[PDB]
Design goal:
The complex is a heterotetramer of chains A (238), B (588), C (121) and D (105). Chain A has 238 residues and is of the alpha+beta class. Chain A contains nine helices and seven strands; from the N terminus they run ββαββαβββααααααα. Chain A folds into two domains: 106 residues, Beta-grasp domain (Ubiquitin-like (UB roll)), CATH 3.10.20.30; 132 residues, Fumarate Reductase Iron-sulfur Protein, Chain B, domain 2. In chain A, the strands form two sheets. Chain A has a five-stranded mixed beta sheet with strand order 2-1-5-3-4, covered by helices on one side. Chain A has a two-stranded antiparallel ribbon with strand order 6-7. Chain B has four domains: 325 residues, FAD/NAD(P)-binding domain, CATH 3.50.50; 105 residues, Flavocytochrome C3, Chain A, domain 1, CATH 3.90.700.10; 117 residues, Fumarate reductase/succinate dehydrogenase flavoprotein-like, C-terminal domain (Methane Monooxygenase Hydroxylase, Chain G, domain 1, Up-down Bundle), CATH 1.20.58.100; 41 residues, Rhinovirus 14, subunit 4 (Irregular). In chain B, the strands form five sheets. In chain B, strands 1, 2, 6, 7, 8, 9, 16 and 17 form an eight-stranded mixed beta sheet that branches. In chain B, strands 11-14-13-12 form a four-stranded antiparallel beta sheet, covered by helices on one side. A three-stranded antiparallel beta sheet of chain B has the order 3-5-4. Chain B is an alpha/beta fold. Helices cover 34% and strands 18% of the residues of chain B. Chain C has four helices and no strands. In chain C, helix 1 packs antiparallel against helix 2, helix 1 packs across helix 3 and helix 3 runs antiparallel to helix 4. Chain C is mainly α. Classes of the chains: A alpha+beta (238), B alpha/beta (588), C mainly alpha (121), D mainly alpha (105). Chains in contact: A-B, A-C, A-D, C-D. The structure holds flavin-adenine dinucleotide, protoporphyrin IX containing FE, malate like intermediate (TEO), iron/sulfur cluster, FE3-S4 cluster, FE2/S2 (inorganic) cluster and 1 more. Flavin-adenine dinucleotide (FAD) binds next to helix 1, strand 2, helix 4, strand 7 and helix 11 of chain B. Chain D: Part of an enzyme complex containing four subunits: a flavoprotein, an iron-sulfur protein, plus two membrane-anchoring proteins, SdhC and SdhD. The complex can form homotrimers. Chain D: Keywords: Cell inner membrane, Cell membrane, Electron transport, Heme, Iron, Membrane, Metal-binding, Transmembrane, Transmembrane helix, Transport, Tricarboxylic acid cycle.
Chain lengths: 238, 588, 121, 105
């Protein structure tokens, strides 16, 4: 059984601007594969096809793509969920980011905003614990839903506010992370962190569009996290 | 010099668990340090680790680091170096608590301390009752660990050269390693990273097999590079097949499944692990569980279905609540790749190639070793290794669950803790000449020039097929001597293999071809070694020599890359703080 | 210098996203509407005869349509803004389900008011 | 700062909601729209105050709102400043014209 694809191609040494390209793949009728499987096969037929991938099990965040108009990971999107009678499967780079080559985007700003919220524990060393910091299951639960993020960039690159100000608005990804250290009971700089997010762009460009939630391959919920951050900001500056 | 030179005190090749820890530590000890990685650091295989870190924290029950030292030595089937294993187990607790202070989001006991789960090969009192010493964050521990180390490398402003692919080591006219050449993936630029210390930290090589739990990027790049630089590799025949990979998919489900109370059933619904290992049962040493499952299959007691031949791993009896909290990760993996909900039905599993016990022989300090013509160890100046690419050796012929991550942190840290002394000890190294740097690019120049040669796609598939059939869980003289012949043939094809993407901007073909050379060197040394060891020990299982032979084989095997011949190395049996554990019979 | 994929036509927009781009649009419209409304109000209060003329201006079908749209934009901005504020005070859940469900209930309440605005014209 | 904006927008919106409820009220319960019932409703102190209160609300609410829109879409500094000038002047005009219309009836 045949599958057809329309895939984004661009090579700055060869192409004038980016272009779509048709691809066919003789696929095994009985079994169902994953988009990443297809991609990998297409590369044996066309070696010049560039795209990132590693864990192939949805954990690493390497292969975020816009598939049939929506962001996701190639390694865990089944061909069956994209394929429709008489349409090509359309595959294009995550939106908003510089295209380096074919399906590979420059994740620079994505990381830059991540670095901006200071994503590491900050503990002022007072009252040091004997061994590990003691954290009750009650407190530890508050990281559940936040620490699991794989930095794949699906959410941020599907957020309009991020498109328009990719260097002032932190982005769903970033703010999820920010909250992950705002409520870690072991972090002692909550106040200091919040004073860094009080301006007009870092958090407040978020308009509750909720694209972030729908695209997250790890089913996280940046919208909610952002909401908690606003609460903290009101609690503190109002 | 007609190639850009970037000089550092240390160039760490690899930003996985061990690479990031060592970088972090080298940096904080005042030296400058470049950290190279072919993927963005948090996409390293380490992210995929699930079970946890094994370490005598003594949180779930009073524990003792010697108990852990015991389990490891026995687990290694008595070819783990006991001085190193002692350093590891003894240092462990403190070295892990360090990570918690870095913010690693461990799970928690009711009283607030770090959660530890039972895991394969864990006993109190030197072989007594079942222990629970694997520290975890659900079954995403590797994810938790890697990201924390990344964050810490951010906080600490480490120089990270993300998405540079290391081509080959550079040797000076004295034969000392003085850095490496590396290809920038984004732009295509090629650079010489000049260092007084080159730390290989490139992880494993499961991709030499047809089915592996490993990421696509685990192509034993370090092994290739070491061999090509004339540096020996050790115990390469020791490949750990994890008992429970998802059948037909190869994606791993954690041993934490059996640690939390799951067990293995065969087609007859019998829990066959009680027969094969009466004491530890489903938490026996991995090599043993792996063979058990294969015997069941190989005498028609396995199951079948869409997934193919397999054993059933039953978890449903642990309940939704426990499963969703302690093992959510495998819940998703099982539903995705097996279309099986573990809350309702058992997971179809089969042993899958998982971890490379072999690697570059090193001291506890991280310094890489070679032997002189008289068989004696000498340090390779300017070259170090940590992590899976290393063979310290703390795992000998079978690694314990949760011991790998411990290894990464302990020995990564140790490499940095001891780098300054290692550099003074080796003395100033003579400069690489311009033809010294040239030589490193030989391999890459080949591919760039070869348009009309053989299809590398075909070569790779042939290679993995050969290792799968001839060097899997069970081995025999005939299989392995034939396998090896096919490899020589495959390796000839490769010297004539063609690069079909000529381009320079983010050209992933060039990378995967360069990766293929490494798959080859690794697969090859594994084959030569498995032929060489005429006994059965730990993971290595030969029908034609079914016995462990402590008279002739209580030692390490060493592949000499220039003569392509084999030799041995002593196993260390002199710990410092307790007496050795003598080799006795190993059953679970 | 480098190209980016931002071809809006090639991207799925969920209902929550549409709801919101409409809310922004409806606000910008309402901003222009106030000036138009004010001028009308000023006419209808300046004299008995200005009012008569304002009554006449409202008689035109073309004006009645513009007026209804203006009032439909305001209705929409108001309703969806309350929805937004209800999430801001925790009355509405921030799950993607509850987002879609409230967005739809907004559209219905808006159509209802849009008709009542039609009648009132 | 941004916290301030967030609150002002939402506060004004609560005032404006009540005003719309008030105005919708009158309309949907006054049948015959005679010049006389019209001017009497709009001569009442309660109607005068609420409307100026509402105009100030629009001055603030709409200005923040428009500023957000502009700083999303209009990059070049000069052009954006110009548009903000026009917008603010327009908004001030609204309140002043409101003051001319009602304090005149
Ligand atoms: C495969 C696997 C292993 C595993 C596990 C789960 C999976 C799916 N879960 C484990 C667990 O719960 N507990 C445990 O003790 N072990 C577990 N394992 C084993 C363990 O995770 C691994 O052995 C461990 O991750 C080893 O880490 P290491 O730092 O040694 O290797 P790495 O994490 O894969 O990182 C490799 C880095 O090297 C870079 N690289 C490789 N080649 C190059 C070249 N050519 N040039 C430049 N960089 C290179 C990679 O980019 C990567 O950063
Ligand atoms: C009648 C005069 C009004 C004008 C001229 C006006 C104009 C605007 C504008 C231009 C915006 C910017 C939208 C954006 O940031 O995308 C806005 C935002 C907003 N409006 Fe209004 N509006 C008016 C009345 C109201 C009323 C009565 C409400 C009742 C809730 C309201 C609720 C909101 C809310 C909650 C926001 C911000 C939500 C967000 O930032 O996403 N508005 N308004
Ligand atoms: O089973 C695991 O979670 C993991 O596979 C553990 C080790 O040790 O590698
Ligand atoms: S929050 Fe989810 S969608 Fe966003 S970066 Fe993380 S895994 Fe990706
Ligand atoms: S998708 Fe974007 S607008 Fe906010 S709720 Fe979301 S980050
Ligand atoms: S390959 Fe790692 S998540 Fe897709
Ligand atoms: Na190893």
């Amino acid at each position: 059984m045949r599958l057809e694809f329309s895939i984004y191609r661009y090579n700055p040494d060869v192409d004038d601007a980016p272009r779509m390209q048709d691809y066919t793949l003789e696929a095994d009728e009985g079994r169902d594969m994953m988009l990443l499987d297809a991609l990998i096969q297409l590369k044996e037929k066309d070696p010049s096809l560039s795209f990132r991938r590693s864990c192939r099990e949805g954990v690493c965040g390497s292969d975020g793509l816009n598939m049939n108009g929506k962001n996701g990971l190639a390694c865990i999107t089944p061909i069956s969920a994209l394929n429709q009678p008489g349409k090509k499967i359309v595959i294009r780079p995550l939106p908003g980011l510089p295209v380096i080559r074919d399906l590979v985007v420059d994740m620079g700003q994505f990381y830059a905003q991540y670095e901006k919220i200071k994503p590491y524990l900050l503990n002022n060393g007072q009252n040091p614990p004997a061994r590990e910091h003691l954290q009750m299951p009650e407190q530890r639960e508050k990281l559940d839903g936040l620490y699991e993020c794989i930095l794949c960039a699906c959410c941020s690159t599907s957020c309009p506010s991020f498109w328009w100000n990719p260097d002032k608005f932190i982005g769903p990804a970033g703010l999820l992370a920010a909250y992950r250290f705002l409520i870690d009971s072991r972090d002692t700089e909550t106040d200091s962190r919040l004073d860094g997010l009080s301006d007009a762009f870092s958090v407040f460009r978020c308009h509750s569009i909720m694209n972030c939630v729908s695209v997250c391959p790890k089913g996280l919920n940046p919208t909610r996290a952002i909401g908690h951050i606003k609460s903290m900001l009101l609690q503190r500056n109002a | 010099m007609k190639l850009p030179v970037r000089e550092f005190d240390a160039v760490v090749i690899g930003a996985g668990g061990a690479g990031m820890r060592a970088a972090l530590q080298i940096s904080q000890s005042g030296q400058t340090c470049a950290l190279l990685s072919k993927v963005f650091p948090t996409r390293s295989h380490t992210v995929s680790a699930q079970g946890g870190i094994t370490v005598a924290l003594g949180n779930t029950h009073e524990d003792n680091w010697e108990w852990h030292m015991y389990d490891t030595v026995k687990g290694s089937d008595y070819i783990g170096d006991q001085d190193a294993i002692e350093y590891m187990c003894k240092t462990g607790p403190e070295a892990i608590l360090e990570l918690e202070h870095m913010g690693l989001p461990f799970s928690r006991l009711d009283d607030g301390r770090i959660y530890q789960r039972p895991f394969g090969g864990q006993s109190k009192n030197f072989g007594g009752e079942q222990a629970a010493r694997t520290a975890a964050a659900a079954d995403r521990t590797g994810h938790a660990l890697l990201h924390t180390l990344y964050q810490q490398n951010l906080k600490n402003h480490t120089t990270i050269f993300s998405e540079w692919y290391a081509l080959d080591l550079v040797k000076n006219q004295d034969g000392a390693v003085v850095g490496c050449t590396a290809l920038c993936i984004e732009t295509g630029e090629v650079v010489y990273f000049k260092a007084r210390a080159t730390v290989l930290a490139t992880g494993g090589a499961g991709r030499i097999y047809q089915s592996t739990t490993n990421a696509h990027i685990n192509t034993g790049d370090g092994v290739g590079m070491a061999i090509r630089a004339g540096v020996p590799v050790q115990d390469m025949e020791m490949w750990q097949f994890h008992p429970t990979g998802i059948a037909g998919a190869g994606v791993l489900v954690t041993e934490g499944c059996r640690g939390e109370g799951g067990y293995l059933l065969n087609k007859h619904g019998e829990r066959f692990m009680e027969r094969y290992a009466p004491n530890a049962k489903d938490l026996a040493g991995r090599d043993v569980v792996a063979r058990s499952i294969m015997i069941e299959i190989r005498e028609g007691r396995g199951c079948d279905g869409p997934w193919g031949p397999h054993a059933k791993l039953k978890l449903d009896h642990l309940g939704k609540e426990v499963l969703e909290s302690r093992l959510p990760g495998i819940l998703e993996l099982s539903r995705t790749f097996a279309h099986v909900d573990p809350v309702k039905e058992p997971i179809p599993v089969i042993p899958t190639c998982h971890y490379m016990m072999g690697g570059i022989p090193t001291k506890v300090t991280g310094q890489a070793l070679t032997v002189n013509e008289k068989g004696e160890d000498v340090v390779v100046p300017g070259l170090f290794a940590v992590g899976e690419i290393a063979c310290v050796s703390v795992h000998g012929a079978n690694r314990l669950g949760g011991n790998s991550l411990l290894d990464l942190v302990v020995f990564g840290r140790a490499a940095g803790l001891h780098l300054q002394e290692s550099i003074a000890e080796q003395g100033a190294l003579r400069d690489a000449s311009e033809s010294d740097v040239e030589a490193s690019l030989d391999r890459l120049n080949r591919w760039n020039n070869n348009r009309n040669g053989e299809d590398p796609v075909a070569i790779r598939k042939a290679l993995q097929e050969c290792m799968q059939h001839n060097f899997s869980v069970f081995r025999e003289g005939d299989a392995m001597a034939k396998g090896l012949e096919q490899l020589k043939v495959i390796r000839e094809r490769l010297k004539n293999a063609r690069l079909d993407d000529t381009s320079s901007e983010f050209n992933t073909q060039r990378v995967e071809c360069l990766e293929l050379d490494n798959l080859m060197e690794t697969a090859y040394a594994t084959a030569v070694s498995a032929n060489f060891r005429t006994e059965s020990r730990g993971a290595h299982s030969r029908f034609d020599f079914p016995d462990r032979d402590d008279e002739n084989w209580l030692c390490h095997s060493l592949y000499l890359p220039e003569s392509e011949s084999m030799t041995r190395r002593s196993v260390n049996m002199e710990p410092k703080l307790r007496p050795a554990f003598p080799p006795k019979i190993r059953t679970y | 210098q480098r190209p980016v994929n931002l071809d809006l036509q090639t991207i799925r927009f969920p209902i929550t996203a549409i709801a919101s781009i409409l809310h922004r649009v409806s606000g910008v419209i309402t901003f222009v509407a106030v000036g138009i409304l004010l001028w009308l109000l000023g006419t209808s209060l300046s004299s008995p005869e200005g009012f008569e003329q304002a009554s006449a201006i409202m008689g035109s079908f073309f004006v009645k349509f513009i007026m209804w749209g203006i009032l439909t934009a305001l209705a929409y901005h108001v309703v969806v803004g309350i929805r937004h504020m209800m999430m801001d005070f925790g009355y509405l859940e921030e799950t993607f389900e509850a987002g879609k469900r409230s967005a739809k209930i907004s559209f219905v309440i808006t159509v209802v008011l849009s008709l009542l605005a039609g009648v009132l014209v | 700062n941004g916290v301030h904006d967030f609150i002002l927008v939402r506060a004004t919106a609560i005032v404006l909601t009540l005003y719309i409820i008030y105005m919708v009220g009158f309309f949907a319960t006054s049948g015959e729209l005679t010049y006389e019932v019209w001017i009497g409703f709009f001569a009442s102190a309660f109607t005068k105050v609420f409307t100026l209160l509402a105009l100030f609300s629009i001055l603030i609410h709409a200005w923040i709102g428009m500023w957000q829109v502009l700083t999303d879409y209009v990059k070049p500094l000069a052009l954006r400043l110009m548009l903000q000038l026009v917008i603010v002047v327009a908004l001030v005009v609204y309140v002043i014209y409101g003051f001319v219309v009602v304090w005149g009836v």
